[PDB]
Amino acid sequence: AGAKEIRSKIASIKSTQKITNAMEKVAVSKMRKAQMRMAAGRPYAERIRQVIGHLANANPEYRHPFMVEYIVVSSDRGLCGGLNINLFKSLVKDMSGYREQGAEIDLCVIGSKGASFFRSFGGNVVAAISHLGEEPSINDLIGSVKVMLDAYLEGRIDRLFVVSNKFVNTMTQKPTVEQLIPLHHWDYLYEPDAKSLLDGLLVRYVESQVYQAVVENNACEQAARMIAMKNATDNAGELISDLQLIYNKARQAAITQEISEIVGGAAAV
Amino acid sequence: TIVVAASASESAALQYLAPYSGCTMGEYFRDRGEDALIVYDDLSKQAVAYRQISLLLRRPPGREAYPGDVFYLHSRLLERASRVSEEYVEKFTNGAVTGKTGSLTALPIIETQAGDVSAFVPTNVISITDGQIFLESAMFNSGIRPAVNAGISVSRVGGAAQTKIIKKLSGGIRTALAQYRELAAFAQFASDLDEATRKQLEHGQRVTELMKQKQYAPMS
Amino acid sequence: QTGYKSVDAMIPVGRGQRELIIGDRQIGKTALAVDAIINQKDSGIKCVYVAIGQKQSTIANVVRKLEENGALANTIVVAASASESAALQYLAPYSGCTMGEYFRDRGEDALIVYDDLSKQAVAYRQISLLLRRPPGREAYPGDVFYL
Amino acid sequence: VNAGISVSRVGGAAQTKIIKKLSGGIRTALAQYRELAAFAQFASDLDEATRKQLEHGQRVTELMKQKQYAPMSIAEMSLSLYAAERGFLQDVEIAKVGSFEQALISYFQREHAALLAKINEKGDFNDEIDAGIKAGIEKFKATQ
Amino acid sequence: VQPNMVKVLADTVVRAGDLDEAAAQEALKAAEKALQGKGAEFDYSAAAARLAEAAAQLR
Amino acid sequence: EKFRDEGRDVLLFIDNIYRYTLAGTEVSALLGRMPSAVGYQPTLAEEMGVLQERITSTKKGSITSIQAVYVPADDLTDPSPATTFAHLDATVVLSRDIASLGIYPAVDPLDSTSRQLDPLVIGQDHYDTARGVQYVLQRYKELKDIIAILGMDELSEADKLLVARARKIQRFLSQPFFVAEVFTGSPGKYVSLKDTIAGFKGILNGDYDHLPEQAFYMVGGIEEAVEKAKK
Amino acid sequence: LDPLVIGQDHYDTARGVQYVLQRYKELKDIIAILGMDELSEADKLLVARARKIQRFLSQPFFVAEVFTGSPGKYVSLKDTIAGFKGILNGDYDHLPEQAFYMVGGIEEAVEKAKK
Amino acid sequence: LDPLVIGQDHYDTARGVQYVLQRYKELKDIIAILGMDELSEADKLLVARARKIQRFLSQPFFVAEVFTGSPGKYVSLKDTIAGFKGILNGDYDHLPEQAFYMVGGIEEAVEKAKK
Numbered sequence A: 001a002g003a004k005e006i007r008s009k010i011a012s013i014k015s016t017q018k019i020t021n022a023m024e025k026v027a028v029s030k031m032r033k034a035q036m037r038m039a040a041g042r043p044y045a046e047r048i049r050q051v052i053g054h055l056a057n058a059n060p061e062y063r064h065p066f067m068v069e070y071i072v073v074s075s076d077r078g079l080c081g082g083l084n085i086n087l088f089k090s091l092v093k094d095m096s097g098y099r100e101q102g103a104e105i106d107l108c109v110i111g112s113k114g115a116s117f118f119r120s121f122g123g124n125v126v127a128a129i130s131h132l133g134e135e136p137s138i139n140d141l142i143g144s145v146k147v148m149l150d151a152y153l154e155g156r157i158d159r160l161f162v163v164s165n166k167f168v169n170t171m172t173q174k175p176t177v178e179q180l181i182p183l184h185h186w187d188y189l190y191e192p193d194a195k196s197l198l199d200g201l202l203v204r205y206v207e208s209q210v211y212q213a214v215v216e217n218n219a220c221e222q223a224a225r226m227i228a229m230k231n232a233t234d235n236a237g238e239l240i241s242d243l244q245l246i247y248n249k250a251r252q253a254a255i256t257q258e259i260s261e262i263v264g265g266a267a268a269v
Numbered sequence B: 001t002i003v004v005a006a007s008a009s010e011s012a013a014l015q016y017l018a019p020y021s022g023c024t025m026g027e028y029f030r031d032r033g034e035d036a037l038i039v040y041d042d043l044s045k046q047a048v049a050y051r052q053i054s055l056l057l058r059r060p061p062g063r064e065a066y067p068g069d070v071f072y073l074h075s076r077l078l079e080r081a082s083r084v085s086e087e088y089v090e091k092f093t094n095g096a097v098t099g100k101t102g103s104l105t106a107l108p109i110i111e112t113q114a115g116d117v118s119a120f121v122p123t124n125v126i127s128i129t130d131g132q133i134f135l136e137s138a139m140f141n142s143g144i145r146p147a148v149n150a151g152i153s154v155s156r157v158g159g160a161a162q163t164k165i166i167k168k169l170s171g172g173i174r175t176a177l178a179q180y181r182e183l184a185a186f187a188q189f190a191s192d193l194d195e196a197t198r199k200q201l202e203h204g205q206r207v208t209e210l211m212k213q214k215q216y217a218p219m220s
Numbered sequence C: 001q002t003g004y005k006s007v008d009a010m011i012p013v014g015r016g017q018r019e020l021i022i023g024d025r026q027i028g029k030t031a032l033a034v035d036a037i038i039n040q041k042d043s044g045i046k047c048v049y050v051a052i053g054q055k056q057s058t059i060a061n062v063v064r065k066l067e068e069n070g071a072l073a074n075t076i077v078v079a080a081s082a083s084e085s086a087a088l089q090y091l092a093p094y095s096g097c098t099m100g101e102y103f104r105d106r107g108e109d110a111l112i113v114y115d116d117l118s119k120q121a122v123a124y125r126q127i128s129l130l131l132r133r134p135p136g137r138e139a140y141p142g143d144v145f146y147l
Numbered sequence D: 001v002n003a004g005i006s007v008s009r010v011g012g013a014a015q016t017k018i019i020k021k022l023s024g025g026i027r028t029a030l031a032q033y034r035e036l037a038a039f040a041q042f043a044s045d046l047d048e049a050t051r052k053q054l055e056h057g058q059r060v061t062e063l064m065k066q067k068q069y070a071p072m073s074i075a076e077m078s079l080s081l082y083a084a085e086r087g088f089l090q091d092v093e094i095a096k097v098g099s100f101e102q103a104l105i106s107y108f109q110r111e112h113a114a115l116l117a118k119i120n121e122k123g124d125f126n127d128e129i130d131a132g133i134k135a136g137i138e139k140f141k142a143t144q
Numbered sequence E: 001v002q003p004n005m006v007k008v009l010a011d012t013v014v015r016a017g018d019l020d021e022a023a024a025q026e027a028l029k030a031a032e033k034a035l036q037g038k039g040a041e042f043d044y045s046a047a048a049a050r051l052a053e054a055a056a057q058l059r
Numbered sequence F: 001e002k003f004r005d006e007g008r009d010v011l012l013f014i015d016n017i018y019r020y021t022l023a024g025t026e027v028s029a030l031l032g033r034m035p036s037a038v039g040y041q042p043t044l045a046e047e048m049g050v051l052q053e054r055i056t057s058t059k060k061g062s063i064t065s066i067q068a069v070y071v072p073a074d075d076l077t078d079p080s081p082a083t084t085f086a087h088l089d090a091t092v093v094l095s096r097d098i099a100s101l102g103i104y105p106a107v108d109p110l111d112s113t114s115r116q117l118d119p120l121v122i123g124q125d126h127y128d129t130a131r132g133v134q135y136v137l138q139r140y141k142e143l144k145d146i147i148a149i150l151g152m153d154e155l156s157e158a159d160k161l162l163v164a165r166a167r168k169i170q171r172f173l174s175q176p177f178f179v180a181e182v183f184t185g186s187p188g189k190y191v192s193l194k195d196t197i198a199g200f201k202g203i204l205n206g207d208y209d210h211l212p213e214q215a216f217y218m219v220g221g222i223e224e225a226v227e228k229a230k231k
Numbered sequence G, H: 001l002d003p004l005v006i007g008q009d010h011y012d013t014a015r016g017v018q019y020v021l022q023r024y025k026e027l028k029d030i031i032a033i034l035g036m037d038e039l040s041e042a043d044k045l046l047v048a049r050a051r052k053i054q055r056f057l058s059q060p061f062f063v064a065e066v067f068t069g070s071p072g073k074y075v076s077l078k079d080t081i082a083g084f085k086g087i088l089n090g091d092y093d094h095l096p097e098q099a100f101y102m103v104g105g106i107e108e109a110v111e112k113a114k115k
């Protein structure tokens, strides 16, 4: 219709581009905050791995089920750069091996997009939690984790795996699946009993690797969003560039038409 | 002040001639060794009056129906606003006034239609003048009363037209507003900002609030 | 054969065809057409190069490259440069076409290049608006298609 | 040349037999590359099928590059098109695709000059030339 | 405890059985849904592949 | 034209070529001629050609011209910019950002261009050196956004080495002019094309990686950077 | 519209209403593409008040009853200033935006909200 | 294109095809800046059927085998209605988009999807 409509549309796209530019930096800052919360949990994981190891070696007579022969993590907010799909595409591949074998599968969903993927496809679930803060606490995960520990002890599940993205780098978020269950010279003095301690420590260890997984997936969400908002800013510029050419064409055409009308009327009067 | 008027009901010839009459009254003081200031409240209305006379004399039309010499109309007027040397004032006064340089400063006003600075008359006058002060409707509706868009407004004379104190304190004001124009989307995320940047952001917002002033309240 | 693998394999040209070379400024439009003329120094196809509204120095450079490459002896060069009359720029393509038609009417094969058909349209628009003839789209005359 | 919108309405019937037969797999390869070219940087982890198409797409594009004032003959162009379609650039690196081509043409101008002159004559393609070319190329691969 | 080093693997909240069970039952409470299905549902791979291609075009 | 006939190479400076086009539009309207596209004179291309075709290298001398160009409504497709660009051999862009950095010449090495930047005209050596400088300066502009958004620690060792060479190149593009001694407080320099190519080729290859970047600021030829670093 | 002629209270209320509406005009595109949850807590509150002010400016007229079917209303200048000053201050951040559409004075918005 | 001339079945198939493409045209700008992944579950399903309908409208002609080399196809009105009705119902939601491009009849799309 004319240059006025195109002018309004170039202003509309320019407003959105400035906020998407800000959100990329906001995401980078939050990515750095989630990466320090990742490093503040390694000591509790590496030392308990050693304790549970030696305690089993000095007490061979007890072989806890966890030591002899899916939890899925998803986001609560939008603008993710296909963080959910790429893992959900690895969850489908791994589940296939068991669905083809005929083994049954119980699922635990952490976050909103995981629930969406299962309500959209009528998938089964045994435990679920969402609305967890960008800063999660291990206590919220205990309830969801326990439903899987009781299942493994009662034989309702033969193997347990955690499905989460891993922070390979600021530009890479590797979707992965790893098995949670199943897993010197001196001897420790045990209070009250070695069995009581092994039973307690194994629960602290599984609840710990699940928290490690959630926190790392949050760092992946922030990095993925940084990339999504950079892409959106660039795409906006391309549309602005294309619209500006259409605007210049309309500007030049309006001038020629008016001159023809002025000349035409003057050639009569 | 001298007030020269050519109102809307008066002949297009009087509206076309009024800026030249006012300029002639301002040139008296400049040629005699003194200083004067002239305001042309609407050069765009003078152009419209000159277009009426031209199309009625049947002169060949150009872009936006203006005559071929509409650039020469405003240029012949605006090149009279000038600063003349001591030798010109001693030559004109025949020796009476000596050692003094006279001047005529001009503040022409032009109205744009929906921010279109590419229109024929605005393009001509923007190219003739030494600088431009651009006022914006979006800034004026956002409470920034003086409405001066400092990001596009410019004076080619610059620091030569400033006293020593204002020339020393205006340099940082320029840097703080420039930084504020770059960091204006982050206001909704001031918490998530880096400290250095958050320090710059509040400085930019405080210098921006300082520029707001009231009408009829000139400052020394 | 133009001698370019991209053109001769994906966009082939046959004897008697009209193939348009379209694009923005400074991308190799002249380069592609001059190399197509140079490749005809052994094929038996006589060539004609029409320069419309070009700089004199640009025309001189092309002639030197044609003689340096051994192609000038088969080529006819028709020049109407940027400072010449609009009438000569508007008529140069028809003069070059007439020289090329000499070979086609006698059972021979020829190749003609028009360096800027958009500069011929600008020259014809100037003559038309100076004869006071009503203008159309983008101020071009009503018979610009027929030109 | 933009192979997406560039077209010849009457050219198909004008090509010589050798270029008409070998050119079949060029425009399609550039099309397969047109859909993957921008995304190629993160396609190294995608399905093997996509990677084969992308590897070919990056090779064919590189081969189409040529220089000003350097025209190739029907024979020289044919050699290049054969190696690209039939399969002789999969090992060659993208940065070497051009060198491999200059060397391969310098080779056939000494090792098979008669076959070139026979292809430059009418540009006809037969089983003898088809075999003669694979023989020459396979020999070149080991020798230079 | 070791002769050289002492590590305290401190918990962040009380692990009492009532609290422990309560949060597990809350997870079951939310997990409940109107279309639980049989447990053998599959072939949704086409949707995830369709979106993956669109995501390539986006970047 | 007179000086060229004398046997000289001459510089013709035109204060603004857009105002030459507008004066032609004004005269064409006064004479009553029918206006063309976007309201310009019907003779637009001929009036530009009559002026621009006299500026050439003859067999006696050569008139070279530096013309300031104005672009209406920021539109490069407008008849005046379009017609003028058809007669330009080089484009020099002066940048307000570069000036703030402190490089007073202020020519933008990425936006400025020349039709003579071709290996078939200036030889392979000059062309490769110029394209090498432009590649390193392009990569540094991309890395600067990374360093700003994510930090300097996020870059590889090879990228940090490039940033160091890019900064040295960027400062070596500066030069004290004889007319600028009042501003720079230092004597002027006239660098030859041979000395220009040799200095940038060495910094690209890393022959000066041990010197501080400041030693490569306002010095002229590459031997002057070596000494300015010695003290 | 000058403090010397209309008073400082009326002038500040008018400029306050214009500031909120200009800020809402630039947030409208953000809300369309990204959505409303991606705004700050200050912006979410401002968008709610802008939408209430935009509806409190509507008024049933006596000459327009044939077109609307609703009875006309005459609001005094005192009542107008009070109603807009209240919305800007936050005295009606609980009522829905539909309660302010076609009512008259601010008391009729309070009655409309209940129904 | 009237129910009294062509029958309701053809008219509904045509109306349904147009309805699907029209909505897809409206979501273009959102997908352009944010991609397909932010659309609603139903929107994503339509965008998928709209893309298939678009390539199923493509057909190799007998006067174009010289340009392309592929053989031409003649499709009856009955086969045309059946193909588009199946895509609208979701009977072909398991085939890739590129199985509908230049395939003439719908059975050829089923046999093209086998590769």
Ligand SMILES: Nc1ncnc2c1ncn2[C@@H]1O[C@H](COP(=O)(O)OP(=O)(O)OP(=O)(O)O)[C@@H](O)[C@H]1O
Pocket (backbone or CB within 6 Å): C024, C025, C026, C027, C028, C029, C030, C031, C032, D066, D067, D068, D069, F115, F118, F120
């Ligand atoms: N194959 C090539 N290899 C290297 N450089 C090339 C090649 N083809 C073209 N160029 C270069 O492209 C540049 C522009 O080419 P050319 O002057 O022919 O383009 P043009 O479109 O005709 O420009 P103009 O609009 O001025 O007439 C020249 O420097 C030329 O040397």
Ligand SMILES: [Mg+2]
Pocket (backbone or CB within 6 Å): C029, C030, C031, C115
């Ligand atoms: Mg050319």
